[PDB]
């Protein structure tokens, strides 16, 4: 059907083949279950450049891990895996032993040819899009397995004919079977790594395509290695938490003015006043409400957050702290945690968010990036249960003011006072440093009074005139065109004066979105490419490029750290721009290491790492 190679006549046979001579072969694990470090890899899969392709069951065939580590100790080529952290992990519990260096991803590589398979633009036609394999291979090699194995399976087992239904069963299944399964894997993947050298190729992305390779392999290392976990205290904070969630309830209650099912689409219509008028769906603090499919009045999160009534953060708090306490908590640390440690996933394409579009991190399960900041008494109930390694001490330490200075990195192009004003101080606050030239406070003192950091930061998140206007409590009103801020008179008048004190701002955001309009896509220093197709959200250009610029810096701290480290520590993890490390008692030595290793001046304003303290466990060095 369109292809490199036909697996059906020549694939699904392959044996004890010599693999060395190949540049590029394909890998596939099958496991019994998802969970590092417990469920054990039961078979695996590998497709050849050449039209060869085979399953081999580890249980039935022993023989096959023989021959794999003799392969694999010489062999110099790239090895490709869809999920290399998955593989190589269930892989290194299961006692095989990859060169972790020549793994390379497929899904990794995806991300950077278009970050938005599961955008969904006003022009979208079904539903989302992902990185997942079967859903690549179809997009760009336009091929597909057959449907017949799903429902082999089903009438084995029982449930949907589907990939999502019967994985968990693959172990339970005849060996022939799985090979019918497993194979097509290792053959879209290869298939798909060898499209992807193509368009990697013609559209000349070979840096950030290397940059994210490079980064690889610390990751997995720190993924492999797990956080170490007080699991006496976790038992201990999921009774705190109880009375979190007992007060969360009783504020909640007090701002509806009676007691309701949050789970109840229906009451939670009622509580907020959900009320339509003229086609218009607004709610009781004059939010307007978008429909459900359903045509109800939306109250998702997204809503809630959109709203200035505290029942609606009152709700989303009651949310979040039941998710800590069932899923952080009792869920990921306490019953799937593995000989006193949890091994949470970090995925090192997807931010926090679940976007795509930018250099970013996060972790799952547990998402240790979902402990709050704004309020310490969620973080003091947490943090304890989280320990360095025996023997060891926690450091934790903080780059200062990080997306701030990649702002002013990225205007300092167009402003050569920022780079000498950081330049003298290389601890300037730029808030501090904008306020005091304008005539204006750090802060805000009384409502109305205009500050810099407001200002600075609806500059950072391209923000209309309006919508900075409202973030100061300065006069604005709603005006059709549909529906949009419209700042007052005294509101343009200090963005004005904020651009002719401080030059340059506004040309990073107009030059920002005029190459997306005509060339379709910016750049990081890096290389990673942010695309805005048909020139959509073109205005946000600016501010996305430096949550790229500083997703791509933070990589470089991983690198940095886990090299200066060595044998002295290990990075236990890194949660927004914090980087947490466990240490030698003999601890300054290495914090110095660290320090000048992380600290750069490459960029056109300094960066900064600044000590946070040091305890026995992740409470105590953060002085909680």
């Given at each position: 059907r369109l292809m490199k190679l036909d697996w059906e006549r020549t694939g699904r046979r392959m044996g004890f083949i010599d693999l060395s001579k190949y540049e590029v072969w394909s890998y596939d694990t099958e496991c019994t279950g998802l969970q590092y470090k417990v469920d054990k890899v039961f078979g695996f899969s590998i497709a050849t450049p050449d039209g060869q392709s085979g399953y081999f069951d580890v249980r039935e065939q022993p023989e096959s891990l023989q021959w794999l580590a003799e392969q694999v100790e010489p062999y110099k080529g790239t090895?490709?895996?869809?999920?290399?952290?998955?593989?190589?992990?269930?892989?290194?519990?299961?006692?095989?032993?990859?060169?972790?260096?020549?793994?390379?991803?497929?899904?990794?590589?995806?991300?950077?040819?278009?970050?938005?398979?599961?955008?969904?633009?006003?022009?979208?036609?079904?539903?989302?899009?992902?990185?997942?394999?079967?859903?690549?291979?179809?997009?760009?090699?336009?091929?597909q397995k057959y449907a017949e194995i799903y429902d082999?399976?089903?009438?084995?087992?029982?449930?949907?004919?589907?990939?999502?239904?019967?994985?968990?069963?693959?172990?339970?299944?005849?060996?022939?079977?799985?090979?019918?399964?497993?194979?097509?894997?290792?053959?879209?993947?290869?298939?798909?790594?060898?499209?992807?050298?193509?368009?990697?190729?013609?559209?000349?992305?070979?840096?950030?395509?290397?940059?994210?390779?490079?980064?690889?392999?610390?990751?997995?290392?720190?993924?492999?290695?797990g956080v170490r976990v007080d699991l006496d205290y976790a038992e201990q904070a999921i009774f705190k938490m109880d009375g979190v969630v007992r007060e969360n309830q009783a504020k909640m209650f007090a701002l509806?003015?009676?007691?309701?099912?949050?789970?109840?689409?229906?009451?939670?219509?009622?509580?907020?006043?959900?009320?339509?008028?003229?086609?218009?769906?607004?709610?009781?603090?004059?939010?307007?409400?978008?429909?459900?499919?359903?045509?109800?009045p939306c109250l998702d999160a997204d809503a809630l957050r959109s709203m200035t009534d505290?029942?609606?953060?009152?709700?989303?708090?009651?949310?979040?702290?039941?998710?800590?306490?069932?899923?952080?908590?009792?869920?990921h640390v306490v019953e799937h945690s593995v000989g006193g440690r949890v091994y949470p996933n970090i995925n090192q394409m997807k931010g926090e968010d679940g976007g795509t579009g930018t250099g970013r991190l996060s972790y799952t399960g547990p998402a240790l990036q979902q402990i709050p900041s704004r309020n310490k008494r969620i973080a003091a109930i947490i943090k304890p249960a989280f320990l360095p390694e025996e023997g060891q001490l926690w450091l934790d330490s903080d780059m200062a003011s990080f997306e701030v200075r990649i702002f002013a990195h990225l205007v300092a192009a167009y402003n050569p006072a920022i780079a000498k004003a950081y330049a003298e101080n290389p601890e300037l606050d730029l808030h501090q440093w904008v306020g005091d030239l304008m005539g204006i406070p750090r802060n805000?003192?009384?409502?109305?009074?205009?500050?810099?950091?407001?200002?600075?930061?609806?500059?950072?998140?391209?923000?209309?005139?309006?919508?900075?206007?409202?973030?100061?409590?300065?006069?604005?009103?709603?005006?059709?065109?549909?529906?949009?801020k419209k700042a007052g008179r005294?509101?343009?008048?200090?963005?004005?004066?904020?651009?002719?004190?401080?030059?340059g701002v506004k040309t990073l955001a107009t030059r920002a979105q005029k190459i997306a309009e005509e060339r379709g896509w910016i750049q990081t220093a890096h290389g990673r490419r942010l695309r805005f197709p048909n020139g959509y959200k073109s205005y946000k250009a600016s501010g996305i490029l430096i949550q790229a610029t500083a997703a791509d810096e933070n990589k470089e701290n991983w690198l940095?750290?886990?090299?200066?480290?060595?044998?002295?520590?290990?990075?236990?993890?890194?949660?927004?721009?914090?980087?947490?490390?466990?240490?030698?008692?003999?601890?300054?030595?290495?914090?110095?290491?660290?320090?000048?290793?992380?600290?750069?001046?490459?960029?056109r304003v300094p960066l900064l790492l600044e000590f946070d303290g040091v305890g026995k466990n992740w409470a105590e060095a953060k002085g909680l």
């Open positions: 090895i490709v895996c869809h999920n290399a952290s998955f593989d190589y992990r269930m892989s290194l519990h299961s006692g095989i032993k990859l060169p972790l260096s020549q793994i390379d991803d497929t899904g990794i590589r995806a991300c950077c040819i278009n970050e938005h398979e599961s955008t969904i633009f006003p022009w979208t036609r079904g539903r989302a899009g992902d990185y997942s394999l079967d859903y690549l291979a179809k997009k760009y090699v336009g091929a082999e399976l089903a009438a084995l087992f029982g449930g949907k004919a589907t990939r999502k239904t019967q994985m968990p069963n693959l172990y339970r299944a005849p060996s022939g079977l799985v090979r019918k399964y497993a194979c097509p894997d290792a053959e879209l993947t290869l298939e798909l790594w060898l499209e992807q050298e193509e368009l990697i190729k013609k559209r000349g992305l070979e840096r950030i395509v290397a940059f994210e390779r490079k980064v690889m392999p610390t990751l997995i290392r720190t993924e492999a290695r509806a003015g009676r007691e309701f099912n949050p789970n109840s689409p229906k009451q939670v219509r009622e509580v907020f006043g959900a009320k339509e008028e003229g086609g218009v769906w607004k709610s009781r603090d004059g939010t307007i409400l978008e429909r459900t499919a359903t045509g109800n505290p029942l609606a953060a009152a709700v989303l708090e009651l949310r979040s702290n039941i998710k800590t306490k069932d899923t952080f908590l009792a869920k805000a003192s009384y409502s109305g009074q205009p500050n810099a950091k407001q200002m600075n930061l609806g500059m950072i998140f391209n923000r209309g005139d309006g919508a900075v206007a409202d973030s100061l409590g300065m006069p604005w009103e709603w005006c059709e065109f549909i529906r949009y005294e509101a343009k008048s200090i963005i004005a004066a904020y651009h002719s004190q401080i030059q940095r750290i886990e090299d200066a480290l060595g044998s002295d520590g290990s990075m236990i993890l890194n949660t927004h721009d914090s980087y947490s490390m466990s240490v030698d008692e003999n601890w300054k030595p290495i914090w110095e290491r660290v320090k000048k290793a992380v600290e750069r001046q490459t960029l």
